[PDB]
Write an enzyme that holds these catalytic residues in place. Structure first.
Site, PDB file in Angstrom:
ATOM      1  N   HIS A 123       0.840  -1.187   0.000  1.00 47.09           N
ATOM      2  CA  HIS A 123       0.000   0.000   0.000  1.00 47.09           C
ATOM      3  C   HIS A 123       0.883   1.248   0.000  1.00 47.09           C
ATOM      4  CE1 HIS A 123      -2.774   2.955   1.866  1.00 47.09           C
ATOM      5  NE2 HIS A 123      -3.784   2.140   1.601  1.00 47.09           N
ATOM      6  N   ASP A 200       3.058  -4.199   8.080  1.00 47.29           N
ATOM      7  CA  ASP A 200       1.835  -3.449   7.824  1.00 47.29           C
ATOM      8  C   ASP A 200       0.676  -4.425   7.996  1.00 47.29           C
ATOM      9  OD1 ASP A 200       0.583  -1.561   4.955  1.00 47.29           O
ATOM     10  OD2 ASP A 200      -0.427  -2.279   6.792  1.00 47.29           O
ATOM     11  N   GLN A 203      -4.731  -4.871   6.934  1.00 46.27           N
ATOM     12  CA  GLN A 203      -5.748  -5.846   6.526  1.00 46.27           C
ATOM     13  C   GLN A 203      -5.725  -7.098   7.389  1.00 46.27           C
ATOM     14  OE1 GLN A 203      -8.091  -5.495   3.990  1.00 46.27           O
ATOM     15  NE2 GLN A 203      -7.376  -3.371   3.940  1.00 46.27           N
ATOM     16  N   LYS A 226     -10.525  -0.406  10.063  1.00 46.05           N
ATOM     17  CA  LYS A 226     -10.479  -1.607   9.202  1.00 46.05           C
ATOM     18  C   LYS A 226     -10.812  -2.889   9.994  1.00 46.05           C
ATOM     19  CE  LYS A 226      -7.972   0.150   5.437  1.00 46.05           C
ATOM     20  NZ  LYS A 226      -6.850  -0.160   4.554  1.00 46.05           N
ATOM     21  N   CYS A 364      -4.738   2.161  -3.815  1.00 44.68           N
ATOM     22  CA  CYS A 364      -3.505   2.646  -3.194  1.00 44.68           C
ATOM     23  C   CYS A 364      -2.354   1.686  -3.442  1.00 44.68           C
ATOM     24  CB  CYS A 364      -3.659   2.882  -1.686  1.00 44.68           C
ATOM     25  SG  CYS A 364      -4.964   4.057  -1.264  1.00 44.68           S
TER      26      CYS A 364
HETATM   27 ZN   LIG Z   1      -3.637   6.707  -2.813  1.00 48.57          ZN
END
Ligand SMILES: [Zn+2]
Ligand SMILES: [Zn+2]
Lengths: 406, 405
Positions: A123, A200, A203, A226, A364
């Site tokens: 991302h 990261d 998700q 999220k 993204c």
């Molecule tokens: Zn973006």
């Protein structure tokens, strides 16, 4: 299935509305999730009963609110199996968490002949902060490639690691492809050359049990919105010894022990990294989201979301004409797909005309779009409150999209 | 004529007891309480409209995006900005100040060049500048105050020079209550070519904000100090300056394009909003602005001045307590000390009677040093407080004297 999705959907008021003549079908959970009544009520109750600022208070509401806020931090610790609540920092979201590490750990230390390694599927929030560091500090951003099925090529990831790799920042689960990467193995490889590793988890944290001690990551970042919690709240977790050695990020009230014009002494972690009044209500709402997830059981959630993913994967391939992008063996319940003639934007717009909410665009992940030689994909991203009937309806709408452009 | 009894019905948190005592919430400078309209706006967003904002195709995303950008437009109207593009959503005043320190000042300022603040700044308008000074070699200068809690304007002017590149000044003081003559100070700072940031965290709850008339270059405030949700605040800046600044946080939403060969950034305001914003907090803040407007800021100011005048006379009539901060223009805040009784004991005993105040340094340790005290006790009022609450507080303060007789 044994998962009582009909009962669970009663907890989410937003699901029960129409979009013109059509029931909402909310398949855009990778962009943000919907909230259960328990989370909405926790936020409202805080403002109706307990609101006050936190720390260094004498009065009853401040004392109550402070313990609720630090209790939320302790619940975050339990949720990700951190060793201590002092390692758990409240931020706005995954994006701020990554910027904090980039500016407080990496930028003050990294030398021009050193490297930061990421994957091709990151991302933008796990790309741009590192690009900013490289532009200012002269170091090089290296990118580990993926294969067409959407998996990291582990042999090439290992090859891109070297004694100059100081930071490795890698996606846990992909918001564009759905891929769950083998992060424990990747972290072990990175540690063998002496790099620190940030995951990261924006998700992954909604869909998998997070155990930062087992993974042995050095940092872990995620976003409340999220994972069924409020907007404006997220978490940076980091190993205590690293957080202690880092400089502060934002400066101001609450993150100091003492301020004079001759010397300023900073607070210990976690407060060292919480400058100004925190998002108190957001932290309390995030704690309610964790309680809600635990009430459903993450093993039960994962079993059901696997059933949804398998059912929708078979169903969209049976429609014919749509090609899935991201076919990894291990996935969160996300299906990106393209048509050879029909533009992604038209797919998303026409599906919304039948009440179905998806995302059509670059998600993204513009470098991923470039790798797949497409401008955009359309993305179905599901949660445990979605149903097989919703999947069926979505596939019927995708067939009608084909018929618009027959 | 201000119908405080009706207004109090809008604030559910006010209607509770602390043990056997009615809550008397006199800690509004730390944070304010919320009206039902604000609480309901947040709940309604999650019950009806929640989705992520921008670049969406579906109905809820379109609705949520319109609501989020409409909140930005309401902020523009609230502070009389020229354009919504100048209004950036952040976590709070503290983040707003760090953004300017890192994106305007640190990439430009040279060693020995100067940043000028006042002695009464909150730590959030001190530490970011100290961080820049340590890294870049510039020098932090401090304009003095007089014992009454006012900026000494002649010395502020004396501290300005050709090497002053940034001036960051308190609008209204959370510790003293002082409202500083910021329009005059901004003019003085502009004469030497400095840019000026105003810390409006306290002023924005109590005064009409007009950034065009003040001619400040930046303006920072916090939602939770003006009847809005936690986790949301605003940085306003002049469009030309924001365009010339580097981005602050990097990531999704603040780019136009990302490749590994080149990254192009979005236009303001989105340039400065990296990642998913606090969508619900912005919507709640817009509800707080609507609520304030429904009461009328002129009416709020008239009533809050009555509260301040009444409480100032009442606490002086108790005897034994000395007010710190007696400026001519004030927001409704009274800091005070006793010559023998510690601030912590005043705050603790008042809370035992349901009265919520703050006893401590109020994030202004250099002010405490100037006044040669470790701490003060602070009564900070809002338009939902009452004369009867003030009376009860003063009776409790008399009982504190009797405890330590
Ligand atoms: Zn973006
Ligand atoms: Zn402080």
């Amino acid at each position: 299935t044994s998962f009582d999705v009909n009962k669970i959907r009663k907890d989410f008021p937003v699901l029960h509305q129409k979009i013109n003549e059509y029931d909402l079908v909310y398949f855009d959970n990778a962009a943000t999730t919907q909230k259960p009544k328990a989370v909405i009520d926790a936020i409202a109750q805080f403002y109706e009963k307990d609101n006050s600022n936190v720390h260094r208070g004498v009065h009853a509401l401040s004392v109550r609110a402070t313990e609720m806020y630090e209790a939320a931090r302790a619940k975050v610790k339990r949720f990700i199996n951190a060793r201590s609540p002092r390692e758990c920092i409240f931020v706005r979201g995954t994006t701020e968490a990554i910027n904090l590490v980039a500016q407080s750990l990496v930028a003050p230390r990294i030398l021009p002949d050193e490297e930061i390694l990421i994957t091709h599927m990151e991302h933008h929030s796990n790309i741009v902060p590192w690009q900013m560091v490289c532009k200012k500090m002269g170091c090089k951003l290296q990118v580990a490639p993926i294969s067409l099925n959407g998996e990291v090529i582990l042999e090439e990831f290992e090859r891109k690691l070297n004694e100059n790799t100081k930071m490795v920042a890698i996606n846990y689960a992909s918001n564009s492809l759905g891929t769950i990467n083998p992060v424990k193995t990747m972290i072990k490889m990175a540690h063998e050359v002496g790099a620190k590793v940030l995951l990261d988890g924006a998700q992954a944290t909604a869909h998998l049990i997070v155990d930062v001690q087992d993974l042995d990551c050095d940092f872990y970042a995620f976003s409340g919105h999220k994972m069924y919690g409020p907007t404006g709240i997220g978490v940076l977790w980091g190993k205590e010894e690293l957080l202690n050695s880092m400089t502060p990020y934002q400066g101001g009230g609450e993150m100091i022990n003492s301020v004079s014009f001759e010397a300023t002494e900073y607070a210990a972690i976690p407060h060292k990294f919480e400058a100004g009044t925190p998002n108190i209500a957001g932290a309390i709402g995030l704690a309610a989201a964790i309680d809600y997830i635990w009430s459903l059981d993450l093993d039960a959630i994962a079993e059901y979301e696997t059933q949804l993913l398998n059912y929708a994967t078979k169903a969209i391939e049976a429609v014919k004409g749509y090609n899935i992008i991201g076919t990894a063996a291990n996935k969160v319940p996300i299906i990106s797909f393209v048509h050879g003639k029909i533009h992604a934007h038209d797919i998303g717009t026409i599906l919304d005309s039948e009440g179905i909410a998806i995302r059509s665009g670059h998600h993204c992940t513009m470098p991923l779009m470039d790798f797949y030689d497409v401008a955009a994909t359309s993305r179905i991203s599901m949660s445990f409150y979605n149903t097989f009937k919703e999947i069926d309806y979505c596939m019927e709408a995708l067939q009608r999209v084909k018929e618009v452009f027959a």
